[PDB]
Each structure stands twice: as C-alpha cells, then as structure tokens.
Amino acid sequence: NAGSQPKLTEAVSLMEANIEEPLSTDDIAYYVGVSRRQLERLFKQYLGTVPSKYYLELRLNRARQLLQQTSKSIVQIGLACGFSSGPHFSSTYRNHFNITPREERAQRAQPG
C-alpha cells in the first residue's frame, strides 16, 4: 500500500513540488536515493503505471485546478503545467478526463 511505501510517496511529493518544469525520472530517482529501475518498479507495483505517466497525470490535475480557478487562457495553463502546445495539452487533457479543458472551465461553477 502506497503510504507504507515511503520511497514512492517521497518521489510523488518531489514531483508535486516541480510541476511547471518537471524533473526527469532519473532526477527523481537521484533525489530520492533509488536507482531508476527501482523507481520504475515502485510506480509499477504501488500505483500501476510508469513514473513519466504518473507525472503527466499530476500535471494534468494541476491544469484542472487552474481551469477551475483562473481566467488564464487554455494556452497559458498548458504552458504553466509543462505542455509545449495548446493542441498537445488539450488532447491529452481530453484523453485523461474525458472532457476538454474548455468544457472543464465551462463546468467549474457546477453547484453539484
């Protein structure tokens, strides 16, 4: 279970501190003190994915937070979350959340 895997939770905390300019997987591993292979094994075992893909999920969730709370353009938000084009940001966002960034912002005020 992830909370009982301190190395994995450490890596995730480090990733959370580096969203706009994300660390390479190798750099996460160096800073947490495991090999790259070991870091990959942790992510595969305790989260079910690879570190780079979890990092993308994290950056997409920060983007969702910005879509719900700012008037920053779609382009601005994509750049702030490490994306390098609008089409790349919006397409990956839509694949992940099954709505577009524009739809997420339109729906931010949903009162439940």
Which residue is listed with tokens 């939770």?
9
Position with the least CB separation from Cl ion: 19
Q: Give the nearest distance from C-beta 20 to Cl ion in angstroms.
A: 4
Stretch that binds Cl ion, among 20-28, 48-56, 71-79, 99-107 (CB under 5 A): 20-28
Q: Give yes or no for residue 16 binding Cl ion (CB under 5 A).
A: no
The distance of Cα 26 from the centroid of its chain, to the nearest Å, equals: 17
Q: Is the CB of 20 or the CB of 103 nearer to Cl ion?
A: 20
C-alpha–C-alpha distance, residues 89 and 75, integer Å: 8
> Is 26 a residue that touches Cl ion (CB under 5 A)?
no
Report yes or no: 82 and 59 within 8 Å, Cβ to Cβ: yes
